[PDB]
XYZ file of C-alpha atoms in Angstrom:
299
model
C -30.207 1.173 -0.260
C -28.880 1.424 -3.801
C -31.996 -0.296 -5.154
C -34.009 2.733 -3.990
C -31.289 5.369 -4.574
C -32.170 7.532 -7.546
C -28.468 8.391 -7.939
C -27.299 4.771 -8.087
C -30.182 3.881 -10.401
C -29.562 6.750 -12.801
C -25.861 5.893 -12.909
C -26.874 2.356 -13.866
C -28.828 3.901 -16.763
C -25.661 5.640 -17.980
C -25.957 9.095 -16.427
C -23.415 10.791 -14.172
C -25.528 11.659 -11.121
C -28.822 12.477 -9.494
C -27.982 15.524 -7.379
C -29.500 17.799 -4.764
C -29.129 21.372 -3.532
C -28.191 21.628 0.145
C -25.933 23.455 2.617
C -24.815 23.217 6.272
C -28.209 24.193 7.683
C -29.919 21.248 5.974
C -27.079 18.808 6.514
C -27.171 19.359 10.296
C -30.945 19.035 10.747
C -33.703 16.522 10.220
C -32.841 13.549 8.011
C -31.278 15.545 5.172
C -27.731 14.231 5.473
C -28.829 10.591 5.706
C -31.118 10.975 2.673
C -28.397 12.690 0.645
C -25.818 10.061 1.557
C -28.182 7.340 0.380
C -29.971 8.843 -2.588
C -27.904 11.622 -4.239
C -24.512 11.530 -5.917
C -23.816 15.251 -6.268
C -24.414 18.250 -4.023
C -24.867 21.879 -5.004
C -24.726 24.808 -2.547
C -28.218 26.230 -2.172
C -26.767 29.591 -1.036
C -23.221 29.327 0.353
C -21.345 29.992 -2.929
C -23.439 32.920 -4.175
C -21.891 36.375 -4.338
C -23.716 37.749 -1.287
C -22.420 34.880 0.877
C -18.878 34.739 -0.450
C -17.904 38.394 -1.168
C -20.257 40.677 0.788
C -17.689 43.505 0.722
C -15.132 43.679 -2.082
C -12.082 41.539 -1.412
C -13.479 40.398 1.956
C -14.369 36.802 1.207
C -16.185 34.331 3.443
C -16.007 30.627 2.645
C -17.290 29.113 5.914
C -20.385 27.463 4.443
C -18.816 26.666 1.077
C -15.857 24.985 2.796
C -18.268 23.011 4.983
C -20.141 21.684 1.951
C -17.006 20.872 -0.049
C -15.451 18.909 2.808
C -18.769 17.179 3.562
C -18.965 16.121 -0.080
C -15.386 14.838 -0.155
C -15.828 12.829 3.056
C -19.027 11.307 1.641
C -17.727 10.668 -1.868
C -20.138 13.056 -3.600
C -19.568 15.158 -6.692
C -19.778 18.901 -6.133
C -21.307 21.706 -8.164
C -20.654 25.395 -7.490
C -22.310 28.712 -8.172
C -23.695 31.079 -9.057
C -20.599 33.076 -10.039
C -22.302 35.886 -12.048
C -25.945 36.676 -11.237
C -27.978 39.855 -10.854
C -29.866 38.479 -7.837
C -28.331 38.034 -4.387
C -25.753 40.566 -5.558
C -24.108 42.914 -3.021
C -24.827 46.601 -3.300
C -21.105 47.341 -3.699
C -21.180 45.509 -7.029
C -24.328 47.097 -8.455
C -23.000 50.554 -7.483
C -20.063 50.229 -9.910
C -20.591 52.135 -13.167
C -17.086 51.884 -14.673
C -16.511 49.148 -17.243
C -12.907 48.393 -16.310
C -13.698 48.333 -12.596
C -16.624 45.945 -12.918
C -14.680 43.728 -15.327
C -11.833 43.445 -12.822
C -14.227 42.825 -9.922
C -16.140 40.140 -11.803
C -12.952 38.415 -12.912
C -11.564 38.449 -9.390
C -14.800 37.074 -7.966
C -14.828 34.208 -10.484
C -11.136 33.455 -10.144
C -11.030 33.553 -6.365
C -13.956 31.145 -5.857
C -12.856 28.725 -8.570
C -9.190 28.659 -7.544
C -10.059 27.955 -3.907
C -11.701 24.655 -4.921
C -9.592 23.969 -8.024
C -9.953 20.392 -9.239
C -12.684 19.524 -6.730
C -15.730 20.895 -8.593
C -17.445 18.975 -11.370
C -19.372 21.940 -12.749
C -19.814 25.638 -12.101
C -22.836 27.805 -12.839
C -20.812 30.663 -14.284
C -23.657 32.880 -15.553
C -27.280 32.555 -14.514
C -30.538 34.148 -15.613
C -29.002 36.273 -18.351
C -32.132 36.163 -20.553
C -35.430 38.006 -20.502
C -38.576 35.961 -21.184
C -38.660 37.216 -24.794
C -35.129 35.901 -25.371
C -33.359 39.260 -25.346
C -30.526 39.692 -22.856
C -31.574 40.746 -19.353
C -30.483 44.304 -18.536
C -28.383 43.681 -15.413
C -25.477 45.699 -14.028
C -23.099 43.342 -15.836
C -24.799 43.858 -19.208
C -25.216 47.607 -18.694
C -21.681 48.323 -17.470
C -19.516 45.766 -19.289
C -21.791 45.181 -22.293
C -22.617 41.971 -24.086
C -18.980 40.858 -23.768
C -19.540 40.140 -20.070
C -20.706 36.593 -20.908
C -17.665 35.756 -23.093
C -15.408 37.337 -20.457
C -16.975 35.446 -17.553
C -16.617 32.076 -19.293
C -13.064 32.707 -20.502
C -12.076 33.787 -16.987
C -13.704 30.717 -15.443
C -11.978 28.324 -17.849
C -8.589 29.806 -16.956
C -9.230 29.575 -13.220
C -10.126 25.867 -13.285
C -10.108 24.150 -16.680
C -11.179 20.876 -15.020
C -14.711 22.090 -14.363
C -17.644 22.029 -16.754
C -18.789 25.630 -17.257
C -22.522 26.192 -17.390
C -24.929 28.918 -18.334
C -28.256 28.379 -16.562
C -31.728 29.782 -16.738
C -35.334 29.124 -15.796
C -38.433 28.878 -17.983
C -36.543 26.693 -20.478
C -39.143 23.969 -19.931
C -41.157 24.305 -23.135
C -39.812 24.048 -26.663
C -42.416 26.691 -27.634
C -41.440 29.380 -25.139
C -39.347 32.106 -26.804
C -36.631 31.921 -24.136
C -35.698 28.317 -24.957
C -34.931 28.827 -28.635
C -33.220 32.138 -27.842
C -30.693 30.663 -25.403
C -30.021 27.904 -27.937
C -29.269 30.421 -30.682
C -27.083 32.627 -28.500
C -25.130 29.715 -27.012
C -24.558 28.323 -30.509
C -23.201 31.729 -31.553
C -21.045 32.170 -28.445
C -19.512 28.715 -28.824
C -18.769 29.362 -32.501
C -16.943 32.443 -31.236
C -14.799 30.255 -28.990
C -16.618 30.965 -25.707
C -16.159 27.917 -23.418
C -19.801 27.218 -22.565
C -19.733 23.520 -21.716
C -23.316 23.189 -20.545
C -26.810 24.588 -20.451
C -28.433 24.008 -17.066
C -32.220 24.199 -17.059
C -33.621 25.116 -13.650
C -36.961 23.340 -14.208
C -39.315 24.978 -11.670
C -42.434 23.329 -13.013
C -46.121 23.864 -12.489
C -48.480 20.908 -12.708
C -48.474 19.216 -16.095
C -45.327 20.937 -17.392
C -43.204 17.792 -17.267
C -44.538 16.743 -20.668
C -43.023 19.863 -22.224
C -39.553 19.037 -20.911
C -39.551 15.965 -23.165
C -39.369 18.409 -26.114
C -37.502 21.304 -24.512
C -34.475 19.336 -23.351
C -33.673 17.944 -26.836
C -34.038 21.490 -28.173
C -31.576 22.748 -25.548
C -29.192 19.946 -26.519
C -29.347 21.153 -30.129
C -27.201 24.150 -29.139
C -24.302 21.700 -29.335
C -22.913 22.121 -25.841
C -20.950 19.167 -24.443
C -23.584 18.743 -21.732
C -27.049 19.732 -20.659
C -28.643 19.180 -17.283
C -31.710 19.653 -15.094
C -30.398 21.917 -12.379
C -32.980 23.041 -9.775
C -35.912 20.716 -10.167
C -39.163 21.081 -8.249
C -42.753 20.482 -9.325
C -45.861 22.147 -7.932
C -48.191 19.327 -6.899
C -45.289 16.826 -7.099
C -47.111 14.596 -9.552
C -45.319 11.352 -10.399
C -46.267 12.096 -14.005
C -44.354 15.397 -14.055
C -41.321 13.995 -12.240
C -41.061 10.866 -14.414
C -41.355 12.978 -17.556
C -38.398 15.140 -16.462
C -36.345 12.026 -15.742
C -37.267 10.531 -19.122
C -36.337 13.769 -20.878
C -32.824 13.453 -19.482
C -32.663 9.719 -20.286
C -33.691 10.505 -23.878
C -30.934 13.133 -24.395
C -27.429 11.731 -24.836
C -25.737 14.917 -23.608
C -27.885 15.171 -20.463
C -25.486 14.243 -17.666
C -27.926 14.309 -14.779
C -30.663 15.877 -12.718
C -30.497 17.952 -9.515
C -33.551 18.407 -7.284
C -33.880 21.712 -5.436
C -33.755 20.419 -1.872
C -34.913 17.360 0.063
C -38.126 17.941 2.054
C -41.193 20.041 1.199
C -41.067 22.569 4.103
C -37.588 23.609 2.899
C -38.505 24.193 -0.765
C -46.901 23.883 -3.388
C -45.417 20.765 -1.713
C -43.119 20.340 -4.732
C -40.235 18.099 -3.573
C -39.639 14.331 -3.383
C -39.751 13.971 0.435
C -42.477 15.137 2.818
C -42.103 17.023 6.087
C -41.554 13.720 7.937
C -38.671 13.038 5.503
C -40.506 10.094 3.996
C -40.336 9.523 0.233
C -43.378 10.733 -1.682
C -45.120 8.908 -4.547
C -43.006 10.815 -7.066
C -39.794 9.511 -5.481
C -41.050 5.930 -5.718
C -42.097 6.545 -9.330
C -38.625 7.785 -10.334
C -37.075 4.705 -8.725
C -39.459 2.440 -10.640
C -38.830 4.276 -13.912
C -35.060 3.942 -13.531
C -34.997 0.312 -12.403
C -34.322 -2.266 -15.114
């Protein structure tokens, strides 16, 4: 099993994990749980730790699905990622209705602290802030930016560090897949600046929702992301329209080529649950791209 497990093989190449996004609905259906046990070393909650799932009315938290995933991971010896803690999407209306800076600051801090404390010491990495950038590299004008101001990112990270200093704290975004695209250099410059200002950004997580042929660009984009000087970078929500072995192998090689890249997470198991962009088909059989990653990693 290990000889065809992308997680075991990537660990044998010196990386920390090959991970997957999942949740109770996947783990109790089809072959998802068996595939994840065999092939993936880290699980991320597809939805169960987002703000809409965990705090749908202020101070009224729901951890049913998040608890399920965390205990499933512990029983199966998997690393655990969490998030997203601060995100403009999947955000309850009670949050976006707040217009007072002190109120939203307190709410955001409590949301971060409550989630992170509940699982303190069990979570390898948290996505603390996601999708904070516009495509031109300016900051996205979300309720957090508008109400708290640019300090919301420093505040979120400082609050997260205090709640669980064991975890690696990530900023994440999409369309960081080309070293030419304005967004990639912009997040690098801003993260460099924030870290110089003492903000505890441990990682940049690149979603990596690719279209066909875009894998080649990740070979250049990921080193550029690593030049921000964060402790870690990662590939966080990988899928590839057309699922070409060439695109998938290029993403894997990009991580292999970057010393600070700790691992890769694919955004689900089987295609119907994702452009047929995943590594397993609707019969839960591995696709050519899965076999190609295995062959690339073997030595």
